[PDB]
Short mmCIF file of C-alpha atoms and ligand atoms in Angstrom, two decimals:
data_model
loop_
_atom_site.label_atom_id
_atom_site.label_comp_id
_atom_site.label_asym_id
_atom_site.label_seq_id
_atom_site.Cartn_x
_atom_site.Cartn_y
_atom_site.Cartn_z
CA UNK A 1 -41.27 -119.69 5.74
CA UNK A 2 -42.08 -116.76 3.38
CA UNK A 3 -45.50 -118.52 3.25
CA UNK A 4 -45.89 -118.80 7.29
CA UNK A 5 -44.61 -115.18 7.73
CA UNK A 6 -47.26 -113.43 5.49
CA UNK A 7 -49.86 -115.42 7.82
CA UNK A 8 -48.21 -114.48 11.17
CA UNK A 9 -48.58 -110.61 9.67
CA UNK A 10 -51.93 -111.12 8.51
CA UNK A 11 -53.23 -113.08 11.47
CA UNK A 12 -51.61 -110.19 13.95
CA UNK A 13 -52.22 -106.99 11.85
CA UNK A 14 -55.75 -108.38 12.13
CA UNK A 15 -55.56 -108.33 16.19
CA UNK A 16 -54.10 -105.03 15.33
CA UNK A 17 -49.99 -105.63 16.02
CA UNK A 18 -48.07 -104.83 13.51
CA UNK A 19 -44.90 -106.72 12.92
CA UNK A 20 -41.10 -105.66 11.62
CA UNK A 21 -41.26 -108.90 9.24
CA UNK A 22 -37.97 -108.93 9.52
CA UNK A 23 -37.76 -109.98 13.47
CA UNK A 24 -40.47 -112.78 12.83
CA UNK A 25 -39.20 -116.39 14.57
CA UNK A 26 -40.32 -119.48 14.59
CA UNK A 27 -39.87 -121.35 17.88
CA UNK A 28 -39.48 -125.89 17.63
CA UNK A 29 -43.38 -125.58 19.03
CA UNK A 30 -45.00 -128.70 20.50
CA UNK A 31 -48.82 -130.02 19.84
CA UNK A 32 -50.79 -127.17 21.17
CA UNK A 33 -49.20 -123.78 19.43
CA UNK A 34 -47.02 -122.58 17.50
CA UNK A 35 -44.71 -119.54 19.52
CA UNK A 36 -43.34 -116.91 17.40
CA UNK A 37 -41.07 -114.13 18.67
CA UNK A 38 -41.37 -110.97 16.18
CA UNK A 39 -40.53 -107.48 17.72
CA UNK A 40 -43.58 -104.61 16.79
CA UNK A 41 -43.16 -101.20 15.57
CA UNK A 42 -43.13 -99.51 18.84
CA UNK A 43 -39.83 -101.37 19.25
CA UNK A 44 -41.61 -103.62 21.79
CA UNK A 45 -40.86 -107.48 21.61
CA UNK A 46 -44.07 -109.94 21.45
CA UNK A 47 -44.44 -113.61 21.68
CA UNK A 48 -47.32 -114.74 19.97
CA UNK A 49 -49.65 -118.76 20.40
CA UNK A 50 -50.46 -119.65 16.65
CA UNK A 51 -53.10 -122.37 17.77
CA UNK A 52 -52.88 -125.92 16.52
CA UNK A 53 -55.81 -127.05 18.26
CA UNK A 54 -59.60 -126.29 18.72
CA UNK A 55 -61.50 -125.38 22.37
CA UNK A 56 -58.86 -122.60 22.97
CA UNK A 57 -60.61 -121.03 25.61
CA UNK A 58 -61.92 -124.20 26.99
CA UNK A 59 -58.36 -125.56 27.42
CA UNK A 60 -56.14 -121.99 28.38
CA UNK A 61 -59.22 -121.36 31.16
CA UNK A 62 -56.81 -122.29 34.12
CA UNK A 63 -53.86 -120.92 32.95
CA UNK A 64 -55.24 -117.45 32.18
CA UNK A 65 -56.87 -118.04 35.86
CA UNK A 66 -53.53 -118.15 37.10
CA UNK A 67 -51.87 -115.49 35.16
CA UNK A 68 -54.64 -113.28 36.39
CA UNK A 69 -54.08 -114.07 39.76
CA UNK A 70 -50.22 -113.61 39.51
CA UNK A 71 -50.33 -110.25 37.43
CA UNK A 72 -53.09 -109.00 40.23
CA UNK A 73 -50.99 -109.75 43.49
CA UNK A 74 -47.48 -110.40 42.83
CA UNK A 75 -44.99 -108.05 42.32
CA UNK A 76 -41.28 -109.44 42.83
CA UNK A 77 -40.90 -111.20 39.19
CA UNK A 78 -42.93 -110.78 35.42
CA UNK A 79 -45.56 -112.67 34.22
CA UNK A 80 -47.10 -113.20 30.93
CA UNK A 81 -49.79 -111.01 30.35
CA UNK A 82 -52.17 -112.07 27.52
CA UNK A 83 -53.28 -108.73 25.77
CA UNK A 84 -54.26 -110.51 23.09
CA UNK A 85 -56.68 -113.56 23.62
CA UNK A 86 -58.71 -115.02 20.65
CA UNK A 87 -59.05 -118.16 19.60
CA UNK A 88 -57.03 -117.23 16.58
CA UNK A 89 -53.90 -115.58 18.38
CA UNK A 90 -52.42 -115.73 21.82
CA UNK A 91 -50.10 -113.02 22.18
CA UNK A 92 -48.12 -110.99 25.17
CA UNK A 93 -45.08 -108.72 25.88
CA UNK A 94 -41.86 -110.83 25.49
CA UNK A 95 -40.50 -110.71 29.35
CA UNK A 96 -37.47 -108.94 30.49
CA UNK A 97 -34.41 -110.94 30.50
CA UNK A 98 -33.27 -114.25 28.75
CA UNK A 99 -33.95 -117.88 30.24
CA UNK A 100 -31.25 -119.61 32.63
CA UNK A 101 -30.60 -122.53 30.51
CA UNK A 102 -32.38 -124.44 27.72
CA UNK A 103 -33.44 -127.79 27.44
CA UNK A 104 -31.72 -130.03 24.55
CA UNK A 105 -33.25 -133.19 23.55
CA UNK A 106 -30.43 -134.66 22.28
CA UNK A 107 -28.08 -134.65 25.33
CA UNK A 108 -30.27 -134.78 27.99
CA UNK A 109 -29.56 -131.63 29.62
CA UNK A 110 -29.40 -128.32 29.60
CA UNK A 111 -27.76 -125.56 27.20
CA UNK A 112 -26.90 -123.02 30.38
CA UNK A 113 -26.88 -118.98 30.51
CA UNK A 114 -25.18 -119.42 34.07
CA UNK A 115 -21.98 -121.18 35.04
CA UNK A 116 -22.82 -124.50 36.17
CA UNK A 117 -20.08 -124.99 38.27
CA UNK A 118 -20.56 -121.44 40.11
CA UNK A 119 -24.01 -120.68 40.40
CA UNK A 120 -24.39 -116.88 41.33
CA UNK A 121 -25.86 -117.06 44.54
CA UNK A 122 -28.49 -114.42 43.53
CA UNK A 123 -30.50 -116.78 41.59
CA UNK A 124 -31.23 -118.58 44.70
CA UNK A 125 -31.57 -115.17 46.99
CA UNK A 126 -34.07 -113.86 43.91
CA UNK A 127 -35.95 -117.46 43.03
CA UNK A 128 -36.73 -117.62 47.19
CA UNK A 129 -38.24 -114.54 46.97
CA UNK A 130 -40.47 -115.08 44.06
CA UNK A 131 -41.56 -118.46 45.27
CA UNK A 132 -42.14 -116.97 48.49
CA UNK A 133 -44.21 -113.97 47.28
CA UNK A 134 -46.39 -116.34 44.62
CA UNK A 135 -47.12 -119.65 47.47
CA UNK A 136 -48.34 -116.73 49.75
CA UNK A 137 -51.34 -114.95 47.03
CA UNK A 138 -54.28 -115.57 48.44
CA UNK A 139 -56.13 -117.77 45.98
CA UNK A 140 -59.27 -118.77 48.46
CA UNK A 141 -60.09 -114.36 47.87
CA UNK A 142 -60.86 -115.56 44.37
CA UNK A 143 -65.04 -115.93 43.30
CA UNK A 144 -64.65 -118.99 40.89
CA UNK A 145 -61.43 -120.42 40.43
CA UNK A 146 -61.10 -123.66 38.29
CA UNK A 147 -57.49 -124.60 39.16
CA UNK A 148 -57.21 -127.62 41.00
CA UNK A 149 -57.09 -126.98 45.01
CA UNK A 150 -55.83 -129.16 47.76
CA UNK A 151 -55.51 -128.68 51.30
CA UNK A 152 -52.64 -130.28 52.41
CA UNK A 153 -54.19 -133.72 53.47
CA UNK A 154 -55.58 -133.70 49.81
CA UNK A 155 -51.95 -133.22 48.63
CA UNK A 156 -50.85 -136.22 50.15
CA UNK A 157 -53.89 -138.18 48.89
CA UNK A 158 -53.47 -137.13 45.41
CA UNK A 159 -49.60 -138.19 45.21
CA UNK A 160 -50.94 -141.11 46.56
CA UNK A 161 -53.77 -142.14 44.48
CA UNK A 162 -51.66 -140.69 41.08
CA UNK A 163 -48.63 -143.17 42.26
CA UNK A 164 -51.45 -146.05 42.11
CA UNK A 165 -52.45 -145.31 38.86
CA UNK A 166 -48.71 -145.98 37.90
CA UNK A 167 -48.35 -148.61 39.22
CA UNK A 168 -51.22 -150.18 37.23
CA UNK A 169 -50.33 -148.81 33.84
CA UNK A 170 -46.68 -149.25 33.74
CA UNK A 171 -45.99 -151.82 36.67
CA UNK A 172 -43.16 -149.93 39.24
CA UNK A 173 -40.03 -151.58 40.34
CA UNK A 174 -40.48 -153.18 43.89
CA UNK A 175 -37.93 -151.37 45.53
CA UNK A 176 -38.68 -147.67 43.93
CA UNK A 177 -42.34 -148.69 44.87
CA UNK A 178 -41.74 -149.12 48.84
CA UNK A 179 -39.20 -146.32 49.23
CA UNK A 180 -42.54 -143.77 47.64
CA UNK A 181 -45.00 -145.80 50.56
CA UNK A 182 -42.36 -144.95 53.62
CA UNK A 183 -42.75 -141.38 52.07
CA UNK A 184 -45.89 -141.64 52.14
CA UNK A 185 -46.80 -143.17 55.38
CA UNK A 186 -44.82 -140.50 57.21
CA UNK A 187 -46.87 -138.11 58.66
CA UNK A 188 -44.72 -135.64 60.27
CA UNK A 189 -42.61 -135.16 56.55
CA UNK A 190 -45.81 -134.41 55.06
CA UNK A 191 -46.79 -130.53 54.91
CA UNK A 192 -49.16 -129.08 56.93
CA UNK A 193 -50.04 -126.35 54.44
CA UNK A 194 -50.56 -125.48 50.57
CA UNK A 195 -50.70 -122.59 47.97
CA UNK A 196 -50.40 -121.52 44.88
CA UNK A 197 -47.75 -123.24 42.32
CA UNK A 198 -46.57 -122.34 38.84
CA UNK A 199 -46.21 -126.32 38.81
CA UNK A 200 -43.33 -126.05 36.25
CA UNK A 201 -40.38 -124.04 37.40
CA UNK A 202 -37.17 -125.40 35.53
CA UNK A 203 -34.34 -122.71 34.16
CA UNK A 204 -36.24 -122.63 30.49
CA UNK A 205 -38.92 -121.04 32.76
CA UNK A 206 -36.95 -118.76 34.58
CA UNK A 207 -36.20 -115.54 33.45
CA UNK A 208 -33.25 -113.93 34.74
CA UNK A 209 -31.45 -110.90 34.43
CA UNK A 210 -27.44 -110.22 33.77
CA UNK A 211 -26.55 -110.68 37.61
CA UNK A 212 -28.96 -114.01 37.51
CA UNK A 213 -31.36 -112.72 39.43
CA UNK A 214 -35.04 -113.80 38.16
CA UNK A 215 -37.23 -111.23 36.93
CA UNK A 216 -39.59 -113.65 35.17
CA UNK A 217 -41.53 -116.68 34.99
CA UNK A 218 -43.25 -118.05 31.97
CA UNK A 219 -45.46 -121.24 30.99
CA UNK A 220 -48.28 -121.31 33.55
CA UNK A 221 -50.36 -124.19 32.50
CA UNK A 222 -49.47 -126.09 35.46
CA UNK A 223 -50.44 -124.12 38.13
CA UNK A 224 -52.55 -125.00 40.63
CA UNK A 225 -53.03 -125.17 44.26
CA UNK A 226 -50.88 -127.97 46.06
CA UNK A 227 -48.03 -128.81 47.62
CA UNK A 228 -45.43 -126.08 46.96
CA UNK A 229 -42.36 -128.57 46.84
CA UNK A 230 -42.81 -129.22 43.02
CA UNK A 231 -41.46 -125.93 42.67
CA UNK A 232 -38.16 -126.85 44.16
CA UNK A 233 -37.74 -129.69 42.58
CA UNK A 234 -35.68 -127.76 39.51
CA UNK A 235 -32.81 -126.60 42.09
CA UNK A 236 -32.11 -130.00 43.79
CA UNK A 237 -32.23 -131.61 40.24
CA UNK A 238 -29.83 -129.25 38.59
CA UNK A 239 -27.95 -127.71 41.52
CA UNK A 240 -27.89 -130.99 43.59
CA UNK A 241 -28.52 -130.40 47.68
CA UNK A 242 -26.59 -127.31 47.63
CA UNK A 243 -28.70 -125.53 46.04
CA UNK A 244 -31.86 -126.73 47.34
CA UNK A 245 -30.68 -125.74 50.44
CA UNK A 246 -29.93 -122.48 49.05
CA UNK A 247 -33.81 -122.05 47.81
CA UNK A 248 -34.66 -123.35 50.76
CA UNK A 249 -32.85 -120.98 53.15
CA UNK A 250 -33.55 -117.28 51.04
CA UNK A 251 -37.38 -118.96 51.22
CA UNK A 252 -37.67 -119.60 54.66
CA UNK A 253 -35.88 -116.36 55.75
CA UNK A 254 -38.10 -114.02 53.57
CA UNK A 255 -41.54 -115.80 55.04
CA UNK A 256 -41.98 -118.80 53.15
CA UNK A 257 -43.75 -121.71 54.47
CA UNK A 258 -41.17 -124.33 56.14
CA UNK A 259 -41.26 -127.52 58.14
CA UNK A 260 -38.47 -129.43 59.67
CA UNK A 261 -38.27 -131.80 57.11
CA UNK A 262 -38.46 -129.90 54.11
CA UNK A 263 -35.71 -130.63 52.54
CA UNK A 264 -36.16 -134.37 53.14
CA UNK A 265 -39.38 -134.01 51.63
CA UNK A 266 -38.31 -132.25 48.54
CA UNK A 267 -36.19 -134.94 48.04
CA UNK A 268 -38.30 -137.71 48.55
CA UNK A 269 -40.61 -135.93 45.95
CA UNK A 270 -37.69 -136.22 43.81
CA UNK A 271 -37.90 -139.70 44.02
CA UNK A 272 -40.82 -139.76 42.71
CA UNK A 273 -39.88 -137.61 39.66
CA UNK A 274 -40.96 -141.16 37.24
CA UNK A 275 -44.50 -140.80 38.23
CA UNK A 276 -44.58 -137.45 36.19
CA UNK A 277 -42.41 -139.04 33.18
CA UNK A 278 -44.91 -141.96 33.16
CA UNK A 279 -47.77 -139.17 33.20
CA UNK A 280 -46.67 -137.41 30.66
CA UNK A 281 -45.79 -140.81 28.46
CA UNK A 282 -49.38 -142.11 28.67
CA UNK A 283 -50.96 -138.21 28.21
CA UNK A 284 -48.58 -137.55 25.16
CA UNK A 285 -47.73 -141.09 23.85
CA UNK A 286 -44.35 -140.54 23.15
CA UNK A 287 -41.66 -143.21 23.36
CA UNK A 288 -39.06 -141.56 24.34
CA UNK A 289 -40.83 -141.04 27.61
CA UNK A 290 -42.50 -144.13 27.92
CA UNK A 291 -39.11 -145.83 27.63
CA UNK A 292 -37.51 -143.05 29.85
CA UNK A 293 -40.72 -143.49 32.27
CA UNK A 294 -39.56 -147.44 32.13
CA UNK A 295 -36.18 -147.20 33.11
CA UNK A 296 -36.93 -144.35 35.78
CA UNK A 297 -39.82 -146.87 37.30
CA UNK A 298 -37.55 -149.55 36.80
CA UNK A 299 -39.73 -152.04 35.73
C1 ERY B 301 -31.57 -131.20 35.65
C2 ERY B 301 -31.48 -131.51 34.17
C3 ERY B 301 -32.72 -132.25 33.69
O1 ERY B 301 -33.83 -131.42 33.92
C4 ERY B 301 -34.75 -131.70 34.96
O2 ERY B 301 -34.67 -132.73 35.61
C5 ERY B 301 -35.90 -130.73 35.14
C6 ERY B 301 -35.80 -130.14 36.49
C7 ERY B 301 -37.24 -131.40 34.86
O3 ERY B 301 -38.22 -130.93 35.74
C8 ERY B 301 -38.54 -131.67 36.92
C9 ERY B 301 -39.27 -130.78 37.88
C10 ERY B 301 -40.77 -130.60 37.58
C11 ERY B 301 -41.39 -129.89 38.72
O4 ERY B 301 -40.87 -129.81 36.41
C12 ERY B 301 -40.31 -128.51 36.26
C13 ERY B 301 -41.35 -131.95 37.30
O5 ERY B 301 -42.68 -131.83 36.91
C14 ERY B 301 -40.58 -132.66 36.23
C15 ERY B 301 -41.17 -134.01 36.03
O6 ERY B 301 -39.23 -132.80 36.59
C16 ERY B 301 -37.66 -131.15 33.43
C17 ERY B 301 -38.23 -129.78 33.29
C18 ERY B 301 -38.68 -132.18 32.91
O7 ERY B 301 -39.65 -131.57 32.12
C19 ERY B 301 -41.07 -131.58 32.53
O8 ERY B 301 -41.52 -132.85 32.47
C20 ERY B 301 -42.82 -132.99 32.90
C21 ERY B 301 -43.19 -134.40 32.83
C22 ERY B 301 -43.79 -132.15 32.00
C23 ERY B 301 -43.27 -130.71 32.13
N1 ERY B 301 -44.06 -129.73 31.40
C24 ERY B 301 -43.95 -129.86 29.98
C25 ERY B 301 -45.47 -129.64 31.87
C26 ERY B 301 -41.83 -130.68 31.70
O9 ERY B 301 -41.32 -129.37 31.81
C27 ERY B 301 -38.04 -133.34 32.17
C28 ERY B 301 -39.02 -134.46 32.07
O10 ERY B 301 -36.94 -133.77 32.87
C29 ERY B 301 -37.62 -132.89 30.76
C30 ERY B 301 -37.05 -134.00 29.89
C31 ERY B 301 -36.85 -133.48 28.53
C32 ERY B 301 -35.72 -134.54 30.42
O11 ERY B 301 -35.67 -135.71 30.74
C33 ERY B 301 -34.46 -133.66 30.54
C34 ERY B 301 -33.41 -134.16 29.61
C35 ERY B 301 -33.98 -133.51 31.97
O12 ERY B 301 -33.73 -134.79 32.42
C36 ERY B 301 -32.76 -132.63 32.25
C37 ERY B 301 -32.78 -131.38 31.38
O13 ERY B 301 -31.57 -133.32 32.00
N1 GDP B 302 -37.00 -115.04 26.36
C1 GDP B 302 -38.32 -115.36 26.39
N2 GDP B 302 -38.71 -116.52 25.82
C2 GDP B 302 -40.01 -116.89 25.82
C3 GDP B 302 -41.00 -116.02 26.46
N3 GDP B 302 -42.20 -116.63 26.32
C4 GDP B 302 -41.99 -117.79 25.64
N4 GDP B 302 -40.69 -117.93 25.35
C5 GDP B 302 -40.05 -119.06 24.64
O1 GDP B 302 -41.00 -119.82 23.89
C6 GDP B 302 -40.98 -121.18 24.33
C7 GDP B 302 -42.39 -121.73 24.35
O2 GDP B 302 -43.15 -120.97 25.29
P1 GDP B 302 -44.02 -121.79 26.34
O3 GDP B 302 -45.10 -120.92 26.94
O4 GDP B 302 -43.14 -122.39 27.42
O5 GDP B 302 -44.62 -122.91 25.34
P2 GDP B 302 -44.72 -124.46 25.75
O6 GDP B 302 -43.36 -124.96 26.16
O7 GDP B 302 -45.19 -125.24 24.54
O8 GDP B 302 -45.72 -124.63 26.86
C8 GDP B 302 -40.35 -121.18 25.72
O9 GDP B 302 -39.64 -122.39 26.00
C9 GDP B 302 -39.43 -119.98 25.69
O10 GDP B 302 -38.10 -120.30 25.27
C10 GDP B 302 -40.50 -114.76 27.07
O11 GDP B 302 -41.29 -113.97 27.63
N5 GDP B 302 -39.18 -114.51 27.00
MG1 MG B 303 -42.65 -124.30 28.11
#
């Protein structure tokens, strides 16, 4: 480690932040980076991208696009802001707050900084609020975006043509397959309009604050333009229909975009949760997910 923290010192001091060596973390990073957590001499906590991968600029484009866009227009939660950008060193401000639960591997489910079984009802006043605020910035006033944009009948198509492309290179389960095709097929479920996602909103992404409210939201490299019910998804999977209804309601009542048959939809995207595990098998290869893709398509 000794070894890796003279590097992270070196590598920063030479993007001139200068580290209390003594603060320096390293994060279980995946394929792409390494994140490190080391607090500077100004007392100010960073999180730094060691890069494990060339093209950095090539493959951060949309997700700096994004985090421009957010830190522009929105003003109800924190966002990463990259004040450092090389293609030796990725590094920001550490956001305000601490993340609502943690992800562990090993169970299958989250490490929580909330009570589970009495979730403050603030999280889902202050989550509406930010989801409402970031699906309204207006992404068209932007000159050359390269985030992925669909209008809404494009939305449809692409869940569509992306459930296909499972269905070839896994095989689905008959009956999971025809419940996705009544979804589908039902036009007046379907939304009528789209905006701006983060794409992966889950409580490792959400920053919150002592009372639970969330200040935060980090890990943009989803975002895009699209249907804005992948952002729900989190609070029906770990909350259950309470409190998707909950994100629902504080959405809806502080301007967010809502149909009649939101919630139904949100939950019929929920069924289709295995097309993203059978994504993300044949993008990163891993077994885990491939098996876990072929139990949740049930082939
Ligand atoms: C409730 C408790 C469960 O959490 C959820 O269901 C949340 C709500 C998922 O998001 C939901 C909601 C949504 C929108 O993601 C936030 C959706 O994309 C995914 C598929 O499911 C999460 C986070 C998924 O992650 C995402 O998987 C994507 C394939 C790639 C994505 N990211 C790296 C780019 C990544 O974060 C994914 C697959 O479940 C993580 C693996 C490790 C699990 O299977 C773990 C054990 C979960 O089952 C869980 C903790 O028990
Ligand atoms: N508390 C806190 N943790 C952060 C922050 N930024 C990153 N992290 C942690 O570092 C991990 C990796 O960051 P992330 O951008 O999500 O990397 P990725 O998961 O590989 O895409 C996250 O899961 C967080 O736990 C921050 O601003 N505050
Ligand atoms: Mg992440």
């Amino acid at each position: 480690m000794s070894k890796d923290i003279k590097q992270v010192i070196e590598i920063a001091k030479k993007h001139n932040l200068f580290l209390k060596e003594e603060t320096i973390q390293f994060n279980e990073s995946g394929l792409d980076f390494q994140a490190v957590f080391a607090q500077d001499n100004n007392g100010i906590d960073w999180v730094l991208r060691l890069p494990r991968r060339e093209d950095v600029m090539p493959r951060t484009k949309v997700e700096k696009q994004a985090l421009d866009l957010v830190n522009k227009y929105a003003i109800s939660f924190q966002a990463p802001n990259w004040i450092i950008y090389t293609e030796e060193l990725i590094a920001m401000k550490k956001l305000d707050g601490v993340p609502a639960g943690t992800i562990d591997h090993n169970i299958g489910n989250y490490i929580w900084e909330i009570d589970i079984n009495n979730v403050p009802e603030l999280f889902h006043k202050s989550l509406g609020r930010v989801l409402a605020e970031l699906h309204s910035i207006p992404s068209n006033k932007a000159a050359a975006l390269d985030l992925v944009v669909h209008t809404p009948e494009e939305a449809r198509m692409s869940m569509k043509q992306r459930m296909d492309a499972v269905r070839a290179k896994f095989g689905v389960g008959e009956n999971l397959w025809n419940r996705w095709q009544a979804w589908l097929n039902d036009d007046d479920m379907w939304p009528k309009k789209t905006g701006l996602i983060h794409g992966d909103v889950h409580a490792g992404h959400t920053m919150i604050d002592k009372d639970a409210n969330v200040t935060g939201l980090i890990d943009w490299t989803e975002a895009k333009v699209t249907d804005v019910s992948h952002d729900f998804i989190f609070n029906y999977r770990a909350f259950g229909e309470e409190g998707l209804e909950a994100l629902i309601l504080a959405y809806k009542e502080i301007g967010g975009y809502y149909w009649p048959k939101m919630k139904e939809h949100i939950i019929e995207l929920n069924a289709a949760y295995p097309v993203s595990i059978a994504e993300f098998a044949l993008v990163s290869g891993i077994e885990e997910y491939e098996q876990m893709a072929k139990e949740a398509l049930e082939v």
